[PDB]
């Protein structure tokens, strides 16, 4: 047989799971019906089942006495969604879901979309919780619209209430339907119509396409009509390939380990087997078995064989996420196409009290590997490294896993803007003569002068040429960007320049490491008179929504800190780019959204300094050390 890589895809509380074990136990049998839970082995880590929902894709593969296959199950909800991604960035088809009240979810119509310009070979609705006020009118309304994909044919529905029987038919319309893919269909069904098995093929190849696409209904919660589904989906569906027997190319899954007894890890093979040592980046693979999938539990498997589907309950270390097992064949895999995650929105993390440290650091690495997209970055003006999370949501769920594992607890905001305090105005100050440091004359002399916007200036020369005070300006540089940005508020230098002269030596007075102290101490004067330049933060944000909440989006704008330009209505929706201050992005973000449901999206930087316009109540976080100019500086304020 094959089997196929389909994941499950759709809103919250929709079934994604249920659905899921369903598929298990309809396709099963071989010693249980229906299984209790509630809770089970599909979704086996803590809280993920003590919790209820799923926050980790799961990976299940069910057989029969015909064929088998495996499959991915993502999480509904936001936050998460860039581990639903990566699930989907494998994944051939997705089994779109859809709950009663679930008319057209958020998700319901993103997963659809990726697939449509990946390649999907067929996407596949199935409406779940039939249970009340459960249409059917309703659900093709919604279709097609949303998926506007090609409309099909039919059908699956009859009775009503408690007299809810499974149908479908429809034969006619599908011929119809079928006439607009192929020139001799039409021909035939304006004089003949053919058979069906032929056209069966038609959609088929269809489907794996990336075109065609059926969708069939069965209720659900009652799991009537779930085990010809189960069959059916299976059916129409598998890979190529195998036929032959030679050559193994896989593509590495992900599947992190965790606390409790290390972990494991998956490949699938479409074509290949699991054994021998490997390659790939001059290293050795290591194996002592065969791999072989299982529906309960997945354990090590003796032997298994070529063109052979499944996952390898194993891996380790000497690896990683997304490995290509070279090789011949997992090249060319690589030409479906990307979906760069994106991941907008992030938050600051901070370790916390000291015995919350040693755990705070070892946690940062381990929930990074449990993460294909957890850029541990670390700041500048603090030693801890900000958290990068699509959202919090999948923050508080990091926080609870740690809390067992390694245990620790630390805070979740965003953090800094740096200061900068790079206004504009102009000042100039200077140049010392001698004193608490012993001159040591260097007269010195820095003309301040704000500018423009967006010219980062700088400077300069000064200068008698003769190496003195060249690598001075050196040291110029230096204490430069130094206070530029730690000081009195904390900024970093921008918007500036600088220039002087002098003086004396040939023989001693101490004029080389002493004048970089002197320079912080110019600067520092002409604080009084600088003002501590906020900056300018902004870039457009420019925020993408539909036509219809933008009117109201753009009246919030003002309110929220933000600034509006003029936004164009493009066909069923709308782009409002505009610029504002910097963040918050949490604050920008969550507005948009709140007044729109669900139906917005955004991101994009921009960079400037340009703004100050933040008054205070703050400007500061420091500084620095070096004896010296340090000394020389707490004296010259006295
Ligand atoms: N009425 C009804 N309720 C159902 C049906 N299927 C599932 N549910 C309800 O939803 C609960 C859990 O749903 P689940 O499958 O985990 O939802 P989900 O799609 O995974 C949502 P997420 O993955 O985002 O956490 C069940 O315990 C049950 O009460 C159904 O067909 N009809």
Redesign the pocket.
């Known amino acids: 047989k094959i089997i196929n890589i389909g994941v499950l895809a759709?809103?919250?509380?929709?079934?994604?799971?249920?659905?899921?074990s369903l598929l298990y136990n309809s396709g099963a049998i071989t010693e249980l019906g229906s299984v209790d839970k509630?809770t089970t082995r599909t979704d086996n880590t803590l809280l993920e089942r003590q919790r209820?929902?799923?926050i980790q894709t799961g990976i299940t593969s069910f057989q029969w006495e015909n064929t088998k296959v495996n499959i991915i199950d993502?999480?509904?909800?936001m936050d998460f969604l860039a581990e639903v991604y990566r699930s989907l960035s494998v994944l051939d088809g997705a089994i779109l879901?859809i709950?009663?009240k679930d008319g057209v979810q958020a998700q319901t119509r993103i997963l659809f979309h990726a697939l449509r310009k990946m390649g999907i070979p067929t996407i596949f609705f199935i409406n779940?919780?039939?249970?009340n006020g459960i249409d059917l009118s309703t659900v093709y309304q919604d279709i097609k619209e949303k998926l506007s994909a090609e409309i099909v044919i039919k059908q699956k529905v009859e009775l009503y209430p408690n007299v809810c029987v499974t149908n479908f038919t429809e034969s006619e319309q599908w011929d119809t339907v079928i006439e607009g893919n192929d020139d001799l269909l039409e021909k035939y069904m304006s004089g003949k119509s053919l058979e069906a098995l032929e056209l069966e093929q038609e959609e088929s190849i269809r489907f794996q396409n990336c075109s065609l696409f059926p969708l069939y209904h069965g209720?659900?919660?009652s799991n009537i009509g779930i085990d010809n589904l189960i069959e059916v989906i299976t059916n129409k569906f598998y890979s190529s390939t195998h036929r032959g027997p030679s050559e193994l190319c896989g593509n590495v899954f992900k599947i992190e380990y965790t606390k409790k007894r290390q972990r494991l890890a998956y490949i699938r093979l479409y074509s290949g087997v699991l054994h021998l040592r490997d390659s790939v980046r001059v290293s050795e693979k290591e194996k002592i078995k065969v791999t072989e999938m299982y529906t309960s539990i997945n354990g090590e498997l003796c032997k298994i064989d070529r063109a052979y589907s499944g996952e390898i309950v194993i891996l380790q270390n000497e690896f990683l996420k997304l490995n290509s097992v070279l090789g011949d064949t997992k090249l060319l895999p690589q030409r479906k196409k990307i979906e760069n995650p994106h991941p907008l929105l992030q938050t600051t993390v901070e370790p916390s009290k000291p015995e919350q440290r040693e755990m705070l650091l070892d946690a940062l690495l381990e929930i990074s590997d449990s993460d294909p997209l957890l850029r541990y970055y670390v700041d500048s003006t603090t030693h801890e490294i900000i958290l990068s999370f699509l959202g919090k949501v999948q923050m508080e769920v990091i926080s609870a896993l740690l809390q067992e594992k390694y245990h620790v607890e630390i805070e979740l905001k965003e953090p800094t803007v740096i200061y900068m305090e790079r206004p504009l105005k102009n000042a100039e100050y200077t140049i010392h003569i001698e004193v608490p440091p012993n001159p040591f004359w260097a007269s010195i002399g820095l003309s301040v002068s704000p500018l423009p916007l967006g010219s980062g200036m700088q400077y300069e020369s000064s200068v008698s040429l003769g190496y003195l005070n060249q690598s001075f300006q050196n040291a110029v540089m230096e204490g430069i960007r130094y206070g530029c940005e730690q000081g009195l508020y904390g900024w970093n230098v921008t918007d500036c320049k600088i220039c002087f002269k002098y003086g004396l030596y040939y023989s001693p007075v101490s004029t080389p490491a002493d004048f970089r102290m002197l320079a912080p101490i110019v600067l520092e004067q002409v604080l009084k008179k600088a003002g501590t330049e906020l900056l300018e933060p902004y870039l457009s944000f420019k925020i993408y929504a539909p036509q219809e909440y933008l009117s109201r989006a753009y009246n919030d704008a003002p309110k929220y800190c933000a600034n509006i330009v003029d936004t164009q209505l493009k066909n069923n929706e709308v782009i409002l780019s505009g610029e504002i201050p910097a963040r918050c992005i949490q604050e920008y973000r969550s507005d948009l959204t709140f007044f729109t449901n669900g139906r917005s999206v955004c991101l994009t930087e921009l960079k400037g300094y340009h703004v100050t316009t933040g008054e205070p109540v703050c400007q500061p976080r420091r500084p620095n050390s070096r004896i010296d100019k340090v000394r020389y500086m707490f004296n010259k304020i006295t």
């Open positions: 759709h809103v919250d509380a929709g079934k994604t799971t249920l659905t899921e509630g209820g929902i799923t993502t999480p509904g909800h879901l709950s009663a779940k919780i039939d249970q209720s659900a919660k």
